[PDB]
Amino acid sequence: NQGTVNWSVEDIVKGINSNNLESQLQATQAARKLLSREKQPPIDNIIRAGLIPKFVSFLGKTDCSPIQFESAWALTNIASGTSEQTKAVVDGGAIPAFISLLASPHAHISEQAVWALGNIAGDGSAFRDLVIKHGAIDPLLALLAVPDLSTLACGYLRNLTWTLSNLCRNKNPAPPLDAVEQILPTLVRLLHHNDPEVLADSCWAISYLTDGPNERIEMVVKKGVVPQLVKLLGATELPIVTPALRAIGNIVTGTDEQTQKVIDAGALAVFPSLLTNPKTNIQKEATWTMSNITAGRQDQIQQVVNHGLVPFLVGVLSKADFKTQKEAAWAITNYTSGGTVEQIVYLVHCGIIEPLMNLLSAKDTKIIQVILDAISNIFQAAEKLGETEKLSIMIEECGGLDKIEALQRHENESVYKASLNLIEKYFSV
Amino acid sequence: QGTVNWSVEDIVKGINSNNLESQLQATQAARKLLSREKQPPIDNIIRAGLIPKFVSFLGKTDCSPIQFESAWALTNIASGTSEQTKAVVDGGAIPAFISLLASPHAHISEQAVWALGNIAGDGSAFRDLVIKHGAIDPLLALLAVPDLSTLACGYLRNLTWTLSNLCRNKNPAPPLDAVEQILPTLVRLLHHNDPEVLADSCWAISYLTDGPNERIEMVVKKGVVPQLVKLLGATELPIVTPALRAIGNIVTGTDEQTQKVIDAGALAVFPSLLTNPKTNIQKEATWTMSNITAGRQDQIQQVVNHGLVPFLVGVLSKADFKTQKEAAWAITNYTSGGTVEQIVYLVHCGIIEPLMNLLSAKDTKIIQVILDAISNIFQAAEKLGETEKLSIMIEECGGLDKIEALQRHENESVYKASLNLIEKYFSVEEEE
Amino acid sequence: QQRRTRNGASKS
Amino acid sequence: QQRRTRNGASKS
Amino acid sequence: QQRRTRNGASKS
Amino acid sequence: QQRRTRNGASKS
């Protein structure tokens, strides 16, 4: 140590417990640097020294903006750590102190308070609800309550948007409805902002709020955000597409009416690039969404056809990783399940058979059932048309008959009963 | 005491000799070692290359003693592991034993029967080898007598047991040719006085019925069901167990084959089976009942008329979980195929609370089975306008709180099943 | 209604 | 037809 | 699958 | 994503 910098925890507590403000500031500064250490900052040592309540008290000293700032930085870093470390900050009564600091005429201190609340709220549903209970929302939204958002600094706006998104995050329980209806209007504005990081965080907040029952989805959708979400869906920034796709994906799990609002916004025109995206997790999310779309009305399936998406689904089913192939299989089953005869004929024309049959070799009992259900559905359409023989031959030409024959000696019940049912009907003598 | 013997080296020296006596003494010392209690040096005897020698002695018709001693030794080797039994087969023992079946020396013939029994008992593979050497005709010929009581007790038992092993195992099952050839003799042994003969015969028949409905027909067509049901009511467990298995197997067949079991009076003895002190018998009997209640309504009505429903409810209440699961199945099949009036009777027998108590089980399948039963019962209630009455009964058994808890929980069938029940039949106010 | 083998699978 | 949540279960 | 077994017998 | 330590801006 010695009369130098890069202090020991022992030297920090000495300076902080002093009656001299100058020395309390130096100690807090030393603590902030320490917690701003690149690798393994001694958070537990600082907590175990009982410094948190001292930091929180400093937040209250409007007489000294510097120590307010340094303490806010320190606590923010402690709050960033583990849940146990975040809890130590909460138990120190830091939340109401940060909220009081939001209205500070010192913007850089207000910003650091926004940051702190973000970390705390981000820990989980419990601490998120604590932040809301202390009445954090009103002050936060009051900071965004300006005629033009471009007047605020970019770092300032990004923090607010991020913290706000964490107040929308997590479930069991989800955020309170009244709090959501209070935040949404501001969320719509930030969705139409020009900054990509703001857009990203905004999209995440929407994806959270829509991750739930149909009631919560309607709250978001009736604010008319779907068109903008679809626009963000066609962005080039992956950090924007991912959350936007998640939001859209969530909305489509809802009712047919809500799904229609996604389709009316032109979402189906960008899905070709999503289903062929280089990132495999985008393909999975996009194929998953398509499966829920094809679980809808026949007129909605017809729009999937009209936008030329079937050949892309067949594509995913052929070359994607197994995880994404599973989602694709589901999309085909829902399609053949709800589709018209004509829609199913078109599906066969697009060459669905061979890619389906090839997945019967997979070591996954569930996808096998899904495919068998799809094949059965197609045969039903073939029955009405009086062309089961033509379909039988196709399956034989795609090497499908051998695979269905193998599933007769399968452990699962649904697999062997379904196989048997198909042979007796269409592949007997 | 329980000791003595030679070294494996000395016996070898004795068998490789040209003196017949020396070979006999060695073969005797062999039999003593392989028959000693216990840990016989089977593998060491095999390593000496003695199996082929024993097999060659089986053909020494000019010396019954060494035939007998060799047959004994090979039997004990064949009684061990598959690898050990295989060494006996590769030694060409099978055709040699079959040649001995017709020996004028009954005790030698008997030993050959025993030996063939261990070989065939190893599995369907070696079983088929025994049959393919034409072992059946000689074996049945030994039983081709007017009165079976003339044969020695141990002799008849070994023969019955060996035959049962020619009926045993699957993948593949024994050839239809062989089964058809053996059955007529099996029917005779089913009517014999000896308990062990009856036991082995029942086992043999339980094997032959453990397959597709076509194999069940071969057996039932000979008219053995009535006798099986008679042996079902035996006091000795070694008879009841295989008899019950045979009956159990037959019932997995068609409604027509099931009816023959009922006509034979099987239902009259099932109360003692469902309340048998042997837990394994209860499971077996409960399993059989569940396949009976999967039949026609008229068949379900005979189950009602014979008063088995209260016993089924009893199993569901106070049996081990494995047996309880089988009971749960029996009640689902009952409620699924039963008439409304048959389901009402079921409810009057106090089925609900025992049924609900299993809803707290840790097994997922039994839960699905029970929710299905509850649904089927509610469907019968709607045809009576007694929906409210049934709903009251369920909460009077603490069953509602159990269904409430299943609103969560993994699996998808339990979601909609539980969810559909409360909406249709409960809901309103209770807690939120 | 569903008949089952001794392992609780199914016959059909 | 069947809508599924992201975990691939079913819309409760 | 399903017990009660007695396939190989040794003579003592 | 959930939190960030400040210098900077990260995750802990």
Side-chain angles (χ1 to χ4, degrees):
Chain A
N1 295 323
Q2 259 289 301
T4 6
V5 207
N6 198 328
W7 298 23
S8 61
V9 180
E10 186 183 0
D11 294 331
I12 297 173
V13 303
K14 178 180 65 170
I16 280 172
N17 294 335
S18 177
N19 296 125
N20 177 215
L21 218 312
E22 301 149 60
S23 308
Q24 286 173 320
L25 179 59
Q26 286 184 355
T28 311
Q29 285 168 359
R32 180 264 285 187
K33 297 172 191 170
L34 232 164
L35 291 162
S36 295
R37 173 185 286 176
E38 290 185 35
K39 63 218 308 310
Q40 278 109 0
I43 299 174
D44 289 330
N45 289 269
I46 285 168
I47 296 171
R48 187 161 63 263
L51 286 171
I52 289 181
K54 283 67 168 57
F55 290 143
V56 173
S57 292
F58 290 153
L59 300 179
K61 303 191 98 304
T62 48
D63 316 328
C64 193
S65 297
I67 200 167
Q68 277 181 315
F69 173 77
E70 293 295 332
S71 306
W73 192 342
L75 266 14
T76 300
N77 283 7
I78 297 168
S80 65
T82 60
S83 292
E84 307 87 81
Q85 294 166 331
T86 304
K87 184 180 179 294
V89 175
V90 176
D91 289 342
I95 296 178
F98 282 122
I99 292 169
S100 298
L101 228 50
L102 294 174
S104 174
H106 301 288
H108 55 283
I109 284 167
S110 177
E111 181 177 357
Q112 196 64 62
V114 171
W115 195 320
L117 265 354
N119 281 4
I120 297 169
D123 173 88
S125 311
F127 290 172
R128 176 248 297 151
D129 288 348
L130 290 183
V131 173
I132 294 173
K133 227 96 77 171
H134 284 282
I137 292 175
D138 267 34
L140 287 170
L141 302 184
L143 297 172
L144 290 311
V146 300
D148 182 70
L149 301 178
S150 305
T151 63
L152 299 150
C154 277
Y156 193 52
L157 227 189
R158 288 165 182 177
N159 279 314
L160 282 165
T161 308
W162 176 76
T163 291
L164 212 59
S165 77
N166 269 342
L167 298 184
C168 294
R169 197 176 180 180
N170 297 286
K171 315 166 76 185
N172 310 123
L177 300 181
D178 63 89
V180 171
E181 282 285 23
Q182 202 180 340
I183 294 167
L184 265 174
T186 298
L187 230 56
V188 177
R189 295 183 61 194
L190 298 170
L191 252 180
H192 290 68
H193 198 57
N194 51 87
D195 185 76
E197 185 172 346
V198 172
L199 262 28
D201 287 329
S202 292
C203 283
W204 279 113
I206 275 67
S207 76
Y208 298 149
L209 297 175
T210 57
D211 189 355
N214 292 7
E215 287 61 35
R216 289 175 176 276
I217 292 173
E218 258 304 340
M219 296 167 61
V220 177
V221 167
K222 88 163 187 283
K223 294 301 194 193
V225 301
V226 180
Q228 182 64 17
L229 285 169
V230 170
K231 194 171 80 69
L232 269 16
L233 203 60
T236 69
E237 300 90 337
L238 184 63
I240 293 171
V241 178
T242 304
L245 176 57
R246 276 185 155 272
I248 295 295
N250 291 340
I251 291 174
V252 168
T253 69
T255 65
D256 294 330
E257 291 69 15
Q258 298 170 317
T259 295
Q260 192 62 52
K261 272 154 167 284
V262 170
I263 298 172
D264 293 342
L268 268 46
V270 60
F271 260 85
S273 70
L274 297 172
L275 295 170
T276 63
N277 195 278
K279 278 298 189 181
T280 197
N281 84 92
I282 300 291
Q283 292 187 20
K284 196 169 105 73
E285 291 287 314
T287 305
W288 169 68
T289 303
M290 288 309 303
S291 76
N292 285 335
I293 293 175
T294 56
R297 305 193 300 264
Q298 293 182 334
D299 59 90
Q300 296 184 323
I301 292 170
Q302 188 56 44
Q303 285 179 291
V304 172
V305 169
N306 292 348
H307 290 68
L309 289 176
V310 176
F312 291 92
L313 266 346
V314 176
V316 170
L317 191 66
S318 295
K319 41 166 70 175
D321 63 319
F322 186 72
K323 246 66 184 169
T324 306
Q325 283 178 303
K326 268 174 66 183
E327 307 296 343
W330 267 106
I332 299 296
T333 297
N334 290 335
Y335 182 109
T336 57
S337 173
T340 64
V341 173
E342 190 180 19
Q343 286 171 327
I344 292 173
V345 171
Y346 170 77
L347 178 63
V348 175
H349 286 169
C350 288
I352 190 62
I353 296 174
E354 187 165 0
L356 273 181
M357 299 300 165
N358 294 346
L359 280 167
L360 268 34
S361 306
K363 304 299 177 184
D364 185 276
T365 303
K366 184 51 169 165
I367 189 173
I368 292 169
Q369 294 183 32
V370 172
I371 298 164
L372 257 17
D373 279 21
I375 298 164
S376 176
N377 292 334
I378 295 167
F379 265 108
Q380 285 177 42
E383 297 248 42
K384 304 181 189 185
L385 292 172
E387 295 185 336
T388 53
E389 179 64 12
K390 286 180 178 58
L391 178 58
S392 290
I393 293 170
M394 282 192 192
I395 295 175
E396 210 169 1
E397 292 169 347
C398 295
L401 176 53
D402 297 322
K403 294 184 174 61
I404 302 172
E405 175 59 43
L407 297 184
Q408 268 149 261
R409 57 180 211 270
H410 193 261
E411 61 191 346
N412 185 268
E413 190 165 286
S414 300
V415 176
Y416 99 89
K417 65 94 183 294
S419 302
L420 222 72
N421 202 340
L422 286 169
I423 278 76
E424 295 175 343
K425 261 166 158 169
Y426 313 119
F427 298 99
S428 64
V429 297
Chain B
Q1 47 136 256
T3 183
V4 92
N5 306 312
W6 296 16
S7 73
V8 179
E9 184 181 352
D10 295 329
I11 167 185
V12 163
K13 157 65 179 59
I15 289 175
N16 297 136
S17 169
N18 223 267
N19 181 21
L20 219 304
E21 276 293 345
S22 303
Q23 288 176 321
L24 183 60
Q25 294 188 351
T27 310
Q28 286 167 4
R31 181 258 283 180
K32 295 291 286 182
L33 272 168
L34 301 170
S35 188
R36 142 265 265 188
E37 206 253 58
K38 206 120 157 56
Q39 303 286 61
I42 298 174
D43 296 330
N44 292 263
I45 266 66
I46 300 170
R47 274 186 266 284
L50 292 171
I51 286 177
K53 311 295 172 52
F54 291 144
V55 171
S56 72
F57 289 156
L58 295 179
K60 239 76 181 182
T61 180
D62 49 320
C63 192
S64 289
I66 195 160
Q67 284 182 314
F68 171 75
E69 294 293 346
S70 303
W72 194 339
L74 260 21
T75 297
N76 289 5
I77 296 169
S79 73
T81 63
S82 292
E83 177 175 359
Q84 287 168 346
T85 304
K86 199 215 179 184
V88 171
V89 175
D90 289 338
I94 292 175
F97 277 126
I98 293 166
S99 301
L100 244 43
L101 291 175
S103 169
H105 311 271
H107 54 280
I108 287 172
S109 175
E110 176 175 357
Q111 194 64 46
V113 171
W114 195 331
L116 268 19
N118 282 336
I119 297 168
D122 178 82
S124 44
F126 289 170
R127 179 202 67 211
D128 290 346
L129 290 181
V130 172
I131 294 176
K132 214 141 58 59
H133 281 81
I136 287 173
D137 284 315
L139 285 167
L140 300 185
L142 295 170
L143 273 41
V145 300
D147 183 28
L148 299 175
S149 295
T150 62
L151 292 96
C153 218
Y155 196 23
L156 216 195
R157 287 170 175 177
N158 275 14
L159 279 150
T160 303
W161 174 78
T162 294
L163 286 181
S164 76
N165 273 341
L166 294 175
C167 297
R168 192 167 175 171
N169 291 284
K170 301 167 64 176
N171 307 338
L176 303 182
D177 311 32
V179 176
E180 195 61 56
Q181 192 182 349
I182 291 167
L183 267 171
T185 296
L186 233 62
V187 174
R188 290 185 60 188
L189 277 36
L190 255 194
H191 293 75
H192 197 250
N193 75 89
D194 185 79
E196 296 188 28
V197 171
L198 291 169
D200 294 336
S201 302
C202 284
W203 277 113
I205 292 170
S206 72
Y207 300 152
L208 296 175
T209 57
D210 185 14
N213 301 350
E214 289 66 19
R215 292 191 177 272
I216 294 172
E217 262 301 337
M218 297 174 64
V219 180
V220 174
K221 186 174 65 175
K222 266 64 174 178
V224 298
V225 169
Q227 184 64 14
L228 287 172
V229 171
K230 203 183 79 169
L231 279 24
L232 206 63
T235 190
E236 44 266 282
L237 187 58
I239 290 178
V240 179
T241 294
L244 177 57
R245 283 180 142 277
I247 293 295
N249 289 335
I250 295 167
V251 159
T252 70
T254 68
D255 293 20
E256 292 69 7
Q257 298 163 11
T258 295
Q259 192 62 60
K260 271 154 172 171
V261 174
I262 298 172
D263 294 332
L267 268 42
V269 63
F270 255 81
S272 59
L273 297 168
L274 295 169
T275 64
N276 194 278
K278 221 70 253 162
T279 179
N280 186 262
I281 298 290
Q282 285 188 12
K283 190 213 81 76
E284 188 73 29
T286 306
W287 165 69
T288 306
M289 285 304 303
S290 80
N291 286 327
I292 293 173
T293 57
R296 307 190 299 265
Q297 294 178 347
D298 61 90
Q299 298 188 326
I300 289 174
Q301 187 58 36
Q302 285 179 286
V303 175
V304 171
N305 293 345
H306 285 66
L308 296 176
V309 178
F311 293 93
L312 243 43
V313 171
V315 172
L316 201 74
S317 293
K318 52 178 192 298
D320 65 317
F321 185 71
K322 279 164 293 203
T323 306
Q324 286 180 301
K325 208 211 297 174
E326 301 298 336
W329 268 107
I331 286 136
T332 300
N333 294 341
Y334 182 108
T335 56
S336 169
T339 68
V340 170
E341 203 230 325
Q342 286 176 339
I343 293 175
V344 169
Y345 172 82
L346 210 217
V347 174
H348 288 341
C349 289
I351 186 62
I352 302 299
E353 169 156 5
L355 209 56
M356 297 299 160
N357 285 346
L358 282 169
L359 222 57
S360 302
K362 53 271 141 59
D363 183 82
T364 303
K365 191 62 168 294
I366 185 170
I367 289 174
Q368 300 175 11
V369 169
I370 292 165
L371 275 77
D372 282 14
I374 292 166
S375 300
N376 299 329
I377 294 162
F378 264 109
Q379 289 170 8
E382 292 174 340
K383 304 179 187 179
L384 299 161
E386 309 283 34
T387 313
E388 181 60 23
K389 246 144 177 171
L390 177 57
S391 298
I392 290 168
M393 288 196 186
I394 292 171
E395 57 179 343
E396 282 176 352
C397 298
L400 203 161
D401 293 323
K402 275 139 177 170
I403 296 171
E404 183 73 46
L406 296 175
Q407 297 290 66
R408 316 100 164 93
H409 172 244
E410 294 188 26
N411 194 266
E412 175 175 340
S413 56
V414 296
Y415 271 147
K416 247 183 176 182
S418 302
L419 177 57
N420 192 278
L421 281 172
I422 70 96
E423 289 180 8
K424 276 207 178 191
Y425 309 120
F426 295 100
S427 68
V428 196
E429 182 182 11
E430 176 170 326
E431 167 63 14
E432 67 178 17
Chain C
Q1 290 178 309
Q2 176 74 302
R3 284 176 205 264
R4 308 167 301 126
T5 62
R6 235 176 231 87
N7 49 35
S10 274
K11 201 73 184 299
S12 301
Chain D
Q1 295 180 295
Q2 176 64 297
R3 290 177 189 273
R4 305 170 299 123
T5 58
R6 185 168 285 95
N7 54 25
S10 288
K11 189 57 164 186
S12 300
Chain E
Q1 281 186 13
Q2 283 65 55
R3 304 156 194 175
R4 316 299 135 187
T5 60
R6 23 132 280 167
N7 50 19
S10 178
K11 190 185 181 194
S12 308
Chain F
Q1 185 69 290
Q2 287 173 327
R3 315 179 197 157
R4 358 135 132 177
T5 170
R6 201 254 187 171
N7 240 99
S10 301
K11 176 182 185 200
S12 302

